[PDB]
Design a protein around this ligand. Sequence first.
Ligand SMILES: [Cu+2]
Ligand SMILES: [Cu+2]
Ligand SMILES: [Zn+2]
Ligand SMILES: [Zn+2]
Lengths: 154, 155
Amino acid sequence: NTLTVKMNDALSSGTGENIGEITVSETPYGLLFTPHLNGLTPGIHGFHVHTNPSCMPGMKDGKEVPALMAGGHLDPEKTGKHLGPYNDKGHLGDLPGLVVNADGTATYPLLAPRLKSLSELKGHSLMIHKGGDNYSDKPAPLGGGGARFACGVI
Amino acid sequence: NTLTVKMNDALSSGTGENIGEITVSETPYGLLFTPHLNGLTPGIHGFHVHTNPSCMPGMKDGKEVPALMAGGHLDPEKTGKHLGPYNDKGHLGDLPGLVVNADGTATYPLLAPRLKSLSELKGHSLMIHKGGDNYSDKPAPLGGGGARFACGVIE
Ligand SMILES: [Cu+2]
Ligand SMILES: [Cu+2]
Ligand SMILES: [Zn+2]
Ligand SMILES: [Zn+2]
């Protein structure tokens, strides 16, 4: 049982290059996200599930913002707080930071214990930000992920 | 709720330099291993709990092998299979691969959902191998961790 999520670079002018795909599976402890991607800045990237089934860019006060139409972080309990994949009090869509190797690839598997079923990701999207994620709204909001680099509807 | 384990480079002649410590904490989802290490090769390293409370070098077939006395991967139900930290059918000691940044540091926290109490780690050891870990015995046995680079013992 799997979900193959294709990921594409998000541009302010639209959808860019494909950079691989992410395969999600169920384990006795939660959903496992096993990436197979390339062309990413080495390091740890914010990685979250967003509300809307779209990666389309959008205008914000007159400026085009990449993958803006994705909406915010999946948060069916309107917590309104970014606390990470290990805190039952924040965004349910908060996944562990994506690990990007030194050669630009991402292969390290990520476990999101709070997510249990493949039906929970239906009608949403997976996002990879430019920045990292400190699993909090301080000092920088939303973990400090900043701009949206790549996105997948799934 | 916390546990600290000092890690030391493993050499054939004995215990080497200290490279920091790993703090283990209990969470509603299992044991969390938060490393504070340095002096590792960038990338992903095999990271597992080993049976024996020892990091001393041993010898096997003509050579001195670093931290050999630590024994094998903690496997209570003698599965004999290295399936990773999310598979109940393998080594209970199988932790997620250790993430080492580009500057040789290790800080990325690792969650091992299969362990729920600090007590389960008592009388064992934590191991950091030279190679990675694909959570399988194929193509290479034991996720391909290979040689033992650093080790720490525990109560
Ligand atoms: Cu996000
Ligand atoms: Cu090992
Ligand atoms: Zn969030
Ligand atoms: Zn193992």
